[PDB]
Amino acid sequence: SGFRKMAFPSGKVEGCMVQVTCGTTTLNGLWLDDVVYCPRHVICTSEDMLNPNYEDLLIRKSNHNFLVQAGNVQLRVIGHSMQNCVLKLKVDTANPKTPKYKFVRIQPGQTFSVLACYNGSPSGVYQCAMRPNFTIKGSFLNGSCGSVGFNIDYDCVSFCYMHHMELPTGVHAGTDLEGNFYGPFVDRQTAQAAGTDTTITVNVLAWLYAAVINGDRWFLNRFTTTLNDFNLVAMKYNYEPLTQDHVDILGPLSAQTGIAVLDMCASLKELLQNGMNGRTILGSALLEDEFTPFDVVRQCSGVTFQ
Amino acid sequence: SGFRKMAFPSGKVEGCMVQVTCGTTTLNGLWLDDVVYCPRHVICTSEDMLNPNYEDLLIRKSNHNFLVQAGNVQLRVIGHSMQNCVLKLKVDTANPKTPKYKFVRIQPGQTFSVLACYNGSPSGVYQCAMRPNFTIKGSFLNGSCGSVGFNIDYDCVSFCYMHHMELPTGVHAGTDLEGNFYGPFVDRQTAQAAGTDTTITVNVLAWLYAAVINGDRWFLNRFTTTLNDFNLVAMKYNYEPLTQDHVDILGPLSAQTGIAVLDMCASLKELLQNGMNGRTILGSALLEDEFTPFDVVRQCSGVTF
Ligand SMILES: COc1ccc(N(Cc2cc(Cl)cs2)C(=O)Cc2cncc3ccccc23)cc1
């Protein structure tokens, strides 16, 4: 029993983290096969970030301007290209610890484990959710850039996030491993703001199923609802629309608990309308939205990674 | 900036996890050098668990009754002893992935990472505190037994916890790696209950210092308190007494923020009195007590391994 913010084991990703230096700028890189992936802003000084021309800045750098350290063993850069906002450093050595992996771009609502790194060394691991405003609430200090976010889907590490920036609100913004930013953000120091955020409805329902599995059932009611009627109430309270796809993804949790998705929807509708009445769910006073349906199943069914 | 419940990277511990089978019982073992450590209840059946004599159960076992698997590799048991509530299986091979390690016993309030394992394979990693009542609020299912809790310091793993049981409240009980239970618990299926839990006051204060470091001061006030008046108030909310040792341990955070420990104690007193009035502190609607003072410094100063 019990329910915790639970990260994927970090072993396979720890094996892939390196230091990248270009000038007095040092940050983290991801070493997979004979390529190191890192933020393109490694080629920038703090002043350069005000109005960078990345084409011009890269056209001036050569292979030997980029110093990569893998533990305390130097890799030779034998090529460099830019894909969107990531630098790809082609190196002389394939990473022997390269796991089975893909690059995945995630949807808002999806969670991932962050291996927070400084100077190519891991500091720790935690769970994040891609907010509907395309920011993450992370723990990132200067030098954290190039730290990655990942899921393990069966036997495959899926890399979904690379850390780039901290916004003035203190929330974090980054790219997929193809250098495509999540959200309307740019790698220049200019006025940029997190948009108004919404609650991830499918994840709140996932977490109410977690509560039922852990014996916290007080919020279940005899009422039902239609998808349409649920969404009319949800949208009043700044909750993301629930689609039929969301309903189907919640099918396994519904089957395991014997509580219909629309019955759980009716329970949530009353929670939003009435509040908690100074009660808690899984020892939280607020409705939690940073657990996916799969996160609940993985923790509550003891799914393992080998 | 930002502050998050952060586990240690699990890689060095993943390298030590194996499956241990005795009869129809399978659980997790820790493989360090040529020894595998596991809960001694691996030699029990479900009926055995009410009043087991582990000396009598163990003397009946041969080396070959213990099946230790590390991935696809069968490890050969060449010896066994019992130390308190852990079994030590001597195997023919030293774990090549063995890290630098120590065995430590932690105090209530200290935190560690759990690598939750089933059949010798990892499910996930989370951060935990030894509660004042010597339980942990974990996430563990049947087959989780032998999962370990640890801290990393430089490149040394200190193992402080081995998982043995779940209590009726759903909290979890376990031993150090010398097989001594945290708390008054025993490896028997007899009725045992967690003592009344209390909040870890020094950790809540550490976490308020974290919130200040992260640029949030809304909860501060103009007031101070004596240690004695703080403890008289805090105990009415089932908070642990704050000792002068706790106050000294909060010294570095006090110095970094310029907020005296007893002034932060005054802030906490008001927070218990008023609640958050629809606000949050580091994204939390409750007062968090599973960050130690060292955890705040480590995460706010960017310590690596
Ligand atoms: C060349 O040197 C720099 C590179 C990046 C930064 N910024 C600002 C920007 C990044 C982007 Cl992309 C556009 S502006 C960051 O947000 C980096 C950053 C990250 N995560 C925690 C941070 C914490 C403190 C300070 C910076 C942090 C600043 C300087």
Ligand SMILES: COc1ccc(N(Cc2cc(Cl)cs2)C(=O)Cc2cncc3ccccc23)cc1
């Ligand atoms: C020989 O087979 C068994 C061995 C141990 C268990 N128990 C009950 C007891 C353990 C101890 Cl030591 C005394 S009673 C557990 O608590 C294991 C356990 C662990 N963590 C989550 C658990 C969740 C559900 C059920 C059991 C859990 C039961 C059977």
